[PDB]
Amino acid sequence: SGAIYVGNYRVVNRHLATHNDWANLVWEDSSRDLLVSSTTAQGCDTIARCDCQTGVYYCSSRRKHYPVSFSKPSLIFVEASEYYPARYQSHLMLAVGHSEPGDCGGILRCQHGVVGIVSTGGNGLVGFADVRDLLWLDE
Numbered sequence: 502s503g504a505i506y507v508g509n510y511r512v513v514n515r516h517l518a519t520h521n522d523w524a525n526l527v528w529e530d531s532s533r534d535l536l537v538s539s540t541t542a543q544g545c546d547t548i549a550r551c552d553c554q555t556g557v558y559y560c561s562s563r564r565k566h567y568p569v570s571f572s573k574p575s576l577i578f579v580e581a582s583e584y585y586p587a588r589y590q591s592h593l594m595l596a597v598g599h600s601e602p603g604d605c606g607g608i609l610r611c612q613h614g615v616v617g618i619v620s621t622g623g624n625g626l627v628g629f630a631d632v633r634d635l636l637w638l639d640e
């Protein structure tokens with residue numbers, strides 16, 4: 502679990518969005534595993550606007566943060582789960598690091614701000630849905 506709170510927006514994994522997220526829907530994209538809903542309270546998380554390929558993510562299945570080197574956002578094939586059929590997920594960044602399904606939502610940050618959230622993983626890999634291209638999150 503986990504979310505990003507920026508301005509009047511909440512960014513979560515689409516497959517973990519709640520009934521309230523869908524009732525306050527701003528934008529969603531199944532191919533990215535992202536959903537953004539509106540909030541009444543102001544968030545003040547900062548979104549990175551950069552080309553970093555290193556950062557630190559939070560891993561809830563270890564209660565720890567780990568440093569990572571990750572690939573640039575790209576189209577990656579993700580095997581079927583209970584949430585989606587087998588498909589290409591876009592804007593996904595992969596790195597070597599521990600993850601389990603419930604780690605989805607953990608934040609990846611660089612020195613400039615939030616980069617993205619855990620969205621995929623397995624066998625010593627962890628994948629992050631990028632949010633740095635969503636320029637409207639700041640207005």
Ligand SMILES: COc1ccc(Cl)cc1OC(=O)N1CCC[C@H](C(N)=O)C1
Nearest residue numbers: 534579582600601602605620621622623
């Ligand atoms: C962090 O996720 C995992 C980590 C390890 C393992 Cl063995 C499996 C993990 O589950 C996943 O990769 N998915 C399940 C939920 C939906 C995901 C998606 N974005 O399509 C894919």
Ligand SMILES: [Zn+2]
Nearest residue numbers: 551553611613
């Ligand atoms: Zn950065």
